[PDB]
């Protein structure tokens, strides 16, 4: 029961976060929510403990899309698909993308959706890489890089432009693609350790 | 009078962007000025403002971008000329996060700003057009690909941070080698902006 209030919250906050950025207060939640406004406190108290629960929310929405492209046919096809509806999150959502990149985050929470995500973006990258589609260079700490990117071309471009985001997403995922005349990248992707300490 | 001005007025800037990758934008104009050896009431007289101080930079930001596109076009080789320029551009951006600041996140207007777009953009697509021509580049490439190649290497530095210094050349070659014509590939679906959208959005 507090748990159907908890998502409710969450996805109203997410809705509001695409036009209003961060900016929405726990009463405009609740009223967006169709909740009373103690639902909303006693389930978060304040906008940070909002703010990470969202958080932690879209890594273990990504974890389920990674799980879902694991079972793609083609290994190529699924990280490609994989990469557009990570990518979609962030670059159609300004809050969201505030969110996720231009904030550091921390605690038991945040540790435990990093430690189910991480391994799920490795076997991503691996299982392509193998099949010999993928770049060997590539790597599991590519993919946060692929949403910052595309979500600053949404955020320099404006929703005029709402769908150019697309355009650049395309070229990265052509960058990525194994070929015979290809120089090996010279500067590797970021450790488990550095984007560890990137983002915290 | 005017080679004096001149020589003070590049000596402001080159201060202003030597401070402005450590600080950000938050060196003061009173820093500014004892960076450059300069007194407090020159340039105060000369940049009222940090926003005065801000369009001078961004407009010479685009005249040294011009000489980086006319050089790339003496290259031996179209391709190698097109890598070059994109390095050049990006590195000015990726390196200096109140460069990056200024060309990206603040606005720009005036006559100045108008006149230095328009000197730069027919050089960004002579760059661009050289090497499509030679079949190197895909043909949906456009000049307004290139500040977007430096918002994306950008957003690179602002997110890995000044320990990961080098992190934004790995995806600025991933986004040049997406952008090598091919026999096969298949079409970007959507376009890059006119130039009546890349203005609308600076």
Redesign the interface.
């Known amino acids: 029961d507090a748990e159907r209030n908890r998502k409710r919250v969450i996805a109203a906050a997410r809705e509001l976060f695409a036009v209003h950025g961060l900016e929405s207060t726990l009463n405009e939640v609740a009223h967006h929510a169709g909740l009373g406004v103690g639902t909303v406190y006693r389930r978060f108290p304040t906008k940070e403990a909002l703010f990470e629960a969202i958080y932690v929310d879209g890594m273990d929405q990504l974890s389920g899309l990674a799980e879902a492209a694991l079972r793609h046919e083609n290994s190529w096809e699924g990280f490609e698909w994989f990469v557009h509806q990570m990518c979609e999150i962030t670059a159609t959502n300004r809050g969201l993308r505030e969110i996720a990149?231009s904030k550091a985050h921390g605690g038991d929470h945040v540790e435990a959706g990093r430690a189910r995500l991480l391994p799920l973006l490795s076997k991503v990258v691996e299982r392509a890489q193998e099949d010999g589609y993928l770049r060997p260079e590539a790597s599991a700490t590519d993919m946060?890089?692929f949403g910052?990117?595309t979500?600053?071309?949404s955020e320099?471009?404006?929703e005029?432009?709402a769908?150019?985001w697309?355009?650049?997403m395309?070229?990265?995922?052509?960058?990525?693609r194994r070929r015979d005349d290809?120089e090996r990248?010279?500067?590797?992707?970021?450790d488990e350790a550095?984007i560890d300490?990137?983002?915290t």
């Open positions: 990149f946060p890089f910052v990117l979500g600053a071309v320099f471009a404006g005029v432009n769908d150019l697309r355009r650049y395309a070229i990265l995922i052509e960058g990525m290809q990248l010279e500067v590797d992707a970021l550095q300490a990137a983002m």
